[PDB]
Amino acid sequence: KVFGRCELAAAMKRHGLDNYRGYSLGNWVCAAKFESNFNTQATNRNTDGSTDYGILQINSRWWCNDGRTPGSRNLCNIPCSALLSSDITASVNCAKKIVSDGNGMNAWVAWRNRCKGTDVQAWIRGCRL
Ligand SMILES: CC(=O)N[C@@H]1[C@@H](O)[C@H](O[C@@H]2O[C@H](CO)[C@@H](O[C@@H]3O[C@H](CO)[C@@H](O)[C@H](O)[C@H]3NC(C)=O)[C@H](O)[C@H]2NC(C)=O)[C@@H](CO)O[C@H]1O
Numbered sequence: 001k002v003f004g005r006c007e008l009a010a011a012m013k014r015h016g017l018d019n020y021r022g023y024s025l026g027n028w029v030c031a032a033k034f035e036s037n038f039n040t041q042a043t044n045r046n047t048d049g050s051t052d053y054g055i056l057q058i059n060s061r062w063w064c065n066d067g068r069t070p071g072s073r074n075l076c077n078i079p080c081s082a083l084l085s086s087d088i089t090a091s092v093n094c095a096k097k098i099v100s101d102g103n104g105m106n107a108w109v110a111w112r113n114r115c116k117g118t119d120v121q122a123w124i125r126g127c128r129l
C-alpha cells in the first residue's frame with residue numbers, strides 16, 4: 001500500500017507514535033517519506049548483505065529475520081516479510097523498540113540527514129487528527 005500523507009499521520013497517531021520518546025508525529029511522517037516514499041512494500045539491499053524492509057526501512061542485520069542475513073539478530077522477533085503488510089502495526093511496534101535503544105531517531109539515516117533540525121510540523125499540516 002502507498003499511504004497518503006495525512007492517512008499515514010492518522011494511522012501512526014492511532015498506534016501511539018505521537019510524542020513517543022519525545023518525537024512529535026511530524027518526525028515519524030518525515031522519516032517515512034524519505035525512507036520509503038510512504039510505500040509499505042519498499043525493500044533495499046545494503047552492502048553488508050542485509051536488507052531494509054517496509055515503510056520505515058527496518059534493517060535485517062538487527063531487527064527481523066529474512067533467512068539470508070547470516071550472523072544477524074532478530075531483536076523484534078518477527079519475519080521481515082511482516083514489515084511489508086498494508087497494516088503498519090508490526091512496523092510501528094518494532095520502531096518503538098528501535099527508537100528506545102539508545103540513539104533515538106538517529107537510527108534512521110534519512111531522518112538524520114533530511115528531517116532533523118527542520119520544521120517537521122509541516123508534514124502534518126492540514127490533517128484531521
Ligand atoms: C531503522 C534501522 O533498522 N536502522 C539501522 C540501525 O539500527 C543500525 O544502527 C545500529 O543499531 C544497533 C541496535 O540499535 C546499535 O547498537 C546499540 O547501540 C546503542 C548505543 O551505542 C547501545 O546502547 C545498545 O546496547 C546497542 N544494542 C545492541 C543489540 O548492540 C548500533 O550502535 C547501531 N550502529 C550504528 C553505526 O549506528 C544501522 C547500522 O547497522 O543500520 C540501520 O539501518
Ligand SMILES: [Cl-]
Nearest residue numbers: 024025026121
Ligand atoms: Cl510534529
Ligand SMILES: [Cl-]
Nearest residue numbers: 021103104105
Ligand atoms: Cl532521544
Ligand code: NA
Nearest residue numbers: 060064072073
Ligand atoms: Na536478522
